[PDB]
Every structure is written in C-alpha cells, then in structure tokens.
Design an enzyme around this catalytic site. Structure first.
Site, mmCIF file in Angstrom:
data_model
loop_
_atom_site.group_PDB
_atom_site.id
_atom_site.type_symbol
_atom_site.label_atom_id
_atom_site.label_comp_id
_atom_site.label_asym_id
_atom_site.label_seq_id
_atom_site.Cartn_x
_atom_site.Cartn_y
_atom_site.Cartn_z
ATOM 1 N N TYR A 16 0.806 -1.229 0.000
ATOM 2 C CA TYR A 16 0.000 0.000 0.000
ATOM 3 C C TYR A 16 0.804 1.227 0.000
ATOM 4 C CZ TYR A 16 -3.732 -3.290 0.900
ATOM 5 O OH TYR A 16 -4.634 -4.330 0.796
ATOM 6 N N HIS A 21 -4.872 6.001 -1.560
ATOM 7 C CA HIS A 21 -5.620 5.851 -0.302
ATOM 8 C C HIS A 21 -4.709 5.908 0.942
ATOM 9 C CE1 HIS A 21 -9.718 5.083 0.824
ATOM 10 N NE2 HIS A 21 -9.645 3.785 1.099
ATOM 11 N N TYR A 66 -6.263 -1.710 8.728
ATOM 12 C CA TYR A 66 -6.894 -1.584 7.407
ATOM 13 C C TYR A 66 -7.827 -0.411 7.475
ATOM 14 C CZ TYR A 66 -4.811 -5.873 5.815
ATOM 15 O OH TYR A 66 -3.919 -6.857 5.419
ATOM 16 N N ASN A 68 -10.871 0.298 6.651
ATOM 17 C CA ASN A 68 -12.220 0.112 7.065
ATOM 18 C C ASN A 68 -12.338 0.019 8.534
ATOM 19 O OD1 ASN A 68 -13.176 0.006 4.494
ATOM 20 N ND2 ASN A 68 -13.579 -2.224 4.411
ATOM 21 N N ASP A 93 -7.329 10.955 2.139
ATOM 22 C CA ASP A 93 -7.495 11.245 0.664
ATOM 23 C C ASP A 93 -8.916 11.645 0.363
ATOM 24 O OD1 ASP A 93 -7.776 8.450 1.598
ATOM 25 O OD2 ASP A 93 -8.499 8.145 -0.464
ATOM 26 N N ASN A 114 -14.516 5.228 3.477
ATOM 27 C CA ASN A 114 -14.706 4.139 4.417
ATOM 28 C C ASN A 114 -13.996 4.328 5.740
ATOM 29 O OD1 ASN A 114 -16.230 3.018 2.505
ATOM 30 N ND2 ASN A 114 -15.004 1.129 2.254
#
Length: 186
Positions: A16, A21, A66, A68, A93, A114
C-alpha cells in the site's frame, strides 16, 4: 495543555505504500518528521509517536487496522490519552477535490470515505472533529474507483502531492497552535 491526536488514514503494509488511499499516512509521516517524532509505539492497532508541536503535546498515529477499521484504532487511543473530540485531527485522501488540493474542515460527514466513516462511528457518531482533506481527484475515464485508490500517484500527481505535503505541515502546525471556517493558501 490539552493534547491532540493527529491521525493519517491508510492501509498497512508494503503493498500500500505510495498508494492514493495512503496519502494520509504520507502527511502524518511528514508531520512526524518535521516535529522530531519517531512513530515506533505499537498500541491500539496502530503505530504512533508521542511528541509536541510548540508547547502542545500531540500523538501522531497511523492505524494498522486496514482502512475500514480505522475507528477501531483511533477511538481507543483518544480515550486512553484523554484527547477531546475537537483535537482529534483526521488526515485522508479526498476524491472530491482535485489532486494535491488541501482543505481544512471542523466537522462534516465522511463523503463515503470508508475510513472516515468508521472513525465517526467509533467516535460515538460524533462528527465535530477537524479534518484535513488531501485531494486526489476522481478516477480517470472509466477506471475502477477501487483500483484507483489502490494505485500509486502518477509522476505528475506526485509532484503536486509533494507540494501539498509541505503545505500540510504548516497548516497542521497552525491549526494545532492557534487554539468558524478556515481557508488554506499555499
């Protein structure tokens, strides 16, 4: 001397790194660097560092839950460190702003982000916390939105994001030190 909790949203792991994100992670890394804070404490599903901005104590945090489950990490930290709502700064973001454009708000919904959505929920539904949105624009043409989040910035995007990080450091310091809307100017 009420502390601040400065949290940048993202997903954990090498995969990532550099992805759109994760730009909130980049901003907090940059703030941490600028204020001489090392982010090596593991606590409440996060990486964090403790230091200060001026005379204000702050914690800088990158949840490793994560995207979420960001709230799962941030709620407990705010509780632990007695950080009031108004001093819980979220950095993330925002596809509703052009790439590289910053915006500061003192409250608001999640914009379908999210991570922000999960933070709000873990903050008892409260929304009156400050946010620094980092524009990333929308997905080009028909490119899949999800894919877009999880891709790196283009060469050109990158130059603008770098500029935004430098601008971000100063806006955040000012917000935190200054102790009603605000506009940012680079």
């Amino acid at each position: 001397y009420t502390p601040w909790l400065i949290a940048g949203l993202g997903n954990p792991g090498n995969k990532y790194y550099g992805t759109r994100h994760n730009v909130g992670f980049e901003m907090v890394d940059r703030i941490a660097a600028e204020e001489g804070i090392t982010m090596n404490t593991i606590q409440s599903k996060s990486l964090l560092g403790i230091g200060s901005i001026g005379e204000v104590p702050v914690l800088v945090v990158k949840p490793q839950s994560y995207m979420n489950y960001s709230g799962e990490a941030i709620g407990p930290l705010a509780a632990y460190y007695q950080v009031p709502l108004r001093h819980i700064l979220l950095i993330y973001d925002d596809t509703s702003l052009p790439n590289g454009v910053l915006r500061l708000q003192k409250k608001g919904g999640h914009g379908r982000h999210n991570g922000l959505q999960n933070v709000i929920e873990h903050l008892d539904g409260r929304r009156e916390f400050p946010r620094l949105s980092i524009g990333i624009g929308s997905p080009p043409g028909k490119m899949d939105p999800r894919a877009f989040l999880l891709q790196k910035f283009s060469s050109e995007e990158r130059v603008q994001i770098d500029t935004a990080l430098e601008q971000g450091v100063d806006a955040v310091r000012t917000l935190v030190l200054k102790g009603e809307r605000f506009n940012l100017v680079q």
